[PDB]
């Protein structure tokens, strides 16, 4: 019993973090097989960051301009390339600790664990979500660039996120492991519009199911609703529209609690139109949307890796 | 910027988790050097759990009754003893992955990371606090017994918690690594009084400092107060009394934000007597007491391990 923001165990990722140094800049890299992946703005001085010509700047750099440290084992770089917004350093040594892994582009609303890192050394781990507007609300200080987000299925690490940027608004932006930014962002020191966010409806409902599994049942009502009627409520409260796909994803939680999906939408409706009255659900006084239905099932059933 | 419940990276602990099997029971153990530590109720059948005679039950067990699995490496048990509420299995093999480590008894209000585990395999990691009443509010399912809580300073793992028990109230109880329960609890299937909890005042204030560091400044008032006057407010709202020790611990955050401790107590006072008005502080609509001042300094300054 109980429900926490739980991250994946990070050991498999810890053995892949290295320090990457080019000119005056240092940030984190990810060392898998004989390749290190890091944000391409490692090649920039602070002057370059207003409008960098990455091609032109990369041309001035050779293999020996890149220092990769893995603890103390200084790796030797024997090849370099830019793929979108990441740099790929070919090193003479495959990582003895390389896990089975996949590069993935996650979808808005999916969650992952972040291993926040500084000078190639892990600092802490926490869970969060790709927002509908393709930002993440993280905890990242200067030097955390190249920290990665990930999921773990059994023994397989799916890397989905590399940190590039704090927006002047205090939220975070970054790329998949191919170097393509999530969202409209670019790797320049400029103000950049995130655009309107929404709340991840299917995740709130899954959290409502988690609450019922743990004995928090007070928001369970006697009303029901329809998908379209609820979607009327969702649009007004800046919630994502709920589709039959979402209803199917929630089927297993529906069945384990015996509360139909549309019935639990009827409770969410009341919570939206009437608030919480200063009560709490699973210890929070707000509706939480950073648990996917899988996150809930994994925690209330106990899946290991 | 940003502030999250952040756990320590768990890799050092992951390499120590093993499965421990005695009779019909299986739970997690912690393998350091040539000794495995696990809850002593591994030797109990479900009948025994109402009022077990642990001495008498342990007498019926020999070295070969204990199966320790570390992945697949079945370790061989060559010695066994009970220390308080833990069992210590002497195994023929020192753990190649033993980290530098200490056993510690933490104090109420201190925090630690839990690596929740099932059948000796890690499931997820999260942060929490030893409550004033010596329970923890965790996420633990059946089979999570023997999961451990810990802190990490540089390269040193301080183990502070081993999970034994979910109370019929849905909260969690357990021992230090010497086998002594935190709190009044015992390892029997009986209803057990946790006793009145309180809120950890010095932790709320540290979180208030974290909020000011991240730009959430709206609760900053123009009033001040005195330690005794504030303590009047604390006692009424079931907050722990604030002492000069706590004020000294907060000195570094006071200095970095330039807000005197007693001034920030004056804001906490207003928040307690008047609530939040449906606004939020660092994304929460409640006062958060599971960040120590060190937790805050480590996150808003970026300490690594
Ligand atoms: O480390 C750095 C260095 C430079 N820089 C600025 C730009 C990077 C990109 Cl690409 C375009 S502009 C940045 O954003 N970070 C991340 C970061 C900084 C402060 C608090 N939290 C953070 O995550
Ligand atoms: O795994 C077990 C097995 C038996 N058992 C009952 C007693 C143990 C002690 Cl000592 C005295 S009575 C227990 O409490 N757990 C932990 C647990 C169970 C269900 C949800 N969450 C949990 O943590």
Numbering used by the authors:
A (entry chain A), B (entry chain A): 1 to 305
Q: Which of the paper's sentences describe this entry?
A:
Proteolytic processing of the SARS-CoV-2 polyprotein is essential for viral replication and depends on the action of nsp5 (1, 2), which encodes the main protease (MPro), also referred to as 3C-like protease (3CLPro). Herein, we describe the discovery of uracil-based, nonpeptidic MPro inhibitors exemplified by the advanced lead molecule AVI-4516.
To inform further optimization of this scaffold, the x-ray crystal structure of the low-micromolar inhibitor AVI-3318 in complex with MPro was determined to 1.96 Å resolution. With only minor discrepancies between the orientation of the chlorine substituent on the thiophene ring, all major interactions predicted by docking were confirmed in the crystal structure—the pyridinone side chain bound within the S1 pocket and in hydrogen-bonding contact with His163, the hydrophobic chlorothiophene group occupying the S2 pocket. Fortified by the correspondence between the docking poses and the structure of the AVI-3318-MPro complex, we sought to expand the SAR beyond commercially available compounds, which were limited to substitutions of the dihydrouracil nitrogen atoms.
